[PDB]
Ligand binder design. Structure first.
Ligand SMILES: Cc1ccncc1NC(=O)[C@H]1[C@@H]2CCCC[C@@H]21
Ligand SMILES: Cc1ccncc1NC(=O)[C@H]1[C@@H]2CCCC[C@@H]21
Lengths: 304, 304
């Protein structure tokens, strides 16, 4: 028992982190097989960053200008190419620590672990959600670009995020491993609107199920609701509308606890309308939306 | 910017996890050099656990009864001994992945990362505090015993905790790596009083400094207080009394922000007396005490 905001074990990802330097800029790279992936803005200088012409900036660079260091061993760069907002530096040595991996583009509302790095060295790991507006609320300082987000399924690491930017609001933006930004963002130092965000309803419900499983059950009530009625409340409180696909994914938790999904929705409706009244759920004084239903099932069953 | 409950990268610890089976019980072991450390209760059966006679139960066991498996390779046990509540199984092979390490006994109020494991396989990593009453509020299911807590200082892993028990209240208890319990706990299936707990004042103050550094500053006020006055409020609200040693450890954060420690204490006093008024600090609707002043400095400076 107990329920914590748990990150995946980061070892397989730690073995892939490298430092990439181009000119005056240093950031992190991900070394998988004989390729090192990193944000393309490693090629920018201070004067470039308002609106860099990446194609022109890259044309001034040769393989020998990309300094790649894996711990303390230097990698030989034998090719370079830009794909969307990432650079792919071909190296002459395959990473001996390359885990089984995939590149995946996650959906908004899904969760993943971030291994924050500086100078190719891991600093820490934390779990977060991709917001419905495609931003993440992480912990990133200058030099953390190139740090990656991932999930692990047995021995396979699915890389889903590479960090590129901190918006002027302090929230974070980045790309999948093919260099496509999540959201409307571009890799320039400009104020950029992040869409209206919402709370991830299916995750809050999954977390209320994790709370009942672990003994926090004060919020259960004698009520029920419908998807229609619940969605009027979700609308008022800026929660994602709940669909039958969300109800379906909550099936295992509903089956385990015996609490029908719409009955849990009625508990969530009452919490939205009345607040916590100075109480906590799983050590939180707010409704937590950074656990998916899969995360709850995995944590509650001790999956490795 | 951004501030997250970050765990240390777990790779160095993942390389030390093994599975230990004795009879019908399987749990985790920590393989460092040629020794595997695990909870002594791996030698118990269901009928033993109310009050096991560990010395007698261990006398029935030989080296060949301790099955130690590191991933998929079997380790040969050439010695066994019980030290307090841990078993030390001498193996014929030194762990090639043994990091630089220390065994440390942490103080209540200090934080550490836990690598939750089942069957010698890592499941996840999370950061937590050792409560002032020597319990931890973790995420542990049956089979997680032997999972360890640790801190990392550059290349050195300081192991501080090994998981042994879930109290009937759902909170967790364990030992240092010499097998001495933190707190009054014994490794028996009995109801055991955990002392009155308190909130870790110096950590809440450190976290308010992390909040100001990251832009959440609505809680700053025009007031100041004294240690005496603050401690009367700390008393009322079950917070640890603040000492000059705590004020001293907050020095770097006070110097960086320019907010005197007693002025931050006056903000904390007002938050204790008035609550958050439906607002949040660093995404939390309660006063967070799981970040030490060292954690805040490390996270805010990007230490690797
Ligand atoms: C400095 C920093 C801090 C944290 N996370 C990320 C960053 N980096 C950025 O925001 C870079 C974005 C793309 C290229 C142009 C310059 C700025
Ligand atoms: C079952 C479990 C679940 C989570 N964390 C820990 C445990 N294990 C225990 O509580 C064991 C304590 C010491 C020896 C006697 C039996 C019980």
């Amino acid at each position: 028992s107990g329920f914590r905001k748990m990150a995946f074990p980061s070892g397989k990802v730690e073995g892939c982190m490298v430092q990439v330097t181009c000119g005056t800029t240093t950031l992190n790279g991900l070394w998988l097989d004989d390729v090192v992936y990193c944000p393309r803005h490693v090629i920018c200088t201070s004067e470039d960053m308002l609106n860099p012409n990446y194609e022109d900036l890259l044309i001034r660079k040769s393989n020998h200008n990309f300094l790649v260091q894996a711990g303390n061993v230097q990698l030989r760069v034998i090719g370079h190419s830009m794909q969307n907002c990432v650079l792919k530096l071909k190296v002459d040595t395959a990473n001996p620590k390359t885990p089984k991996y995939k590149f995946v583009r996650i959906q908004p509302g899904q969760t993943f672990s971030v291994l924050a790095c500086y100078n190719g060295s891991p600093s820490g790991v934390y779990q977060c959600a991709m917001r419905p507006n495609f931003t993440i609320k992480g912990s990133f300082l200058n030099g953390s670009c190139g740090s990656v987000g991932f999930n692990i399924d047995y021995d396979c690491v699915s890389f889903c995020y590479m960090h590129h930017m901190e918006l002027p609001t302090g929230v974070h933006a980045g790309t999948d491993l093919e260099g496509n930004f999540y959201g409307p963002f571009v890799d320039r130092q400009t104020a950029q609107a992040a869409g209206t965000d919402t709370t991830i309803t299916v995750n809050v419900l999954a977390w209320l199920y994790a709370a009942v499983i672990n003994g926090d059950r004060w919020f259960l009530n004698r009520f029920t609701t419908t998807l229609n009625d619940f969605n009027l409340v979700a609308m008022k409180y800026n929660y994602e509308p709940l669909t039958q696909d969300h109800v379906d994914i909550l099936g295992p938790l509903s089956a385990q606890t015996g609490i029908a999904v719409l009955d849990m929705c009625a508990s969530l409706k009452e919490l939205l309308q009345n607040g916590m009244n100075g109480r906590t759920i799983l050590g939180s004084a707010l409704l937590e939306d950074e656990f998916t239903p899969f995360d709850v099932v995995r944590q509650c069953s001790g999956v490795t």
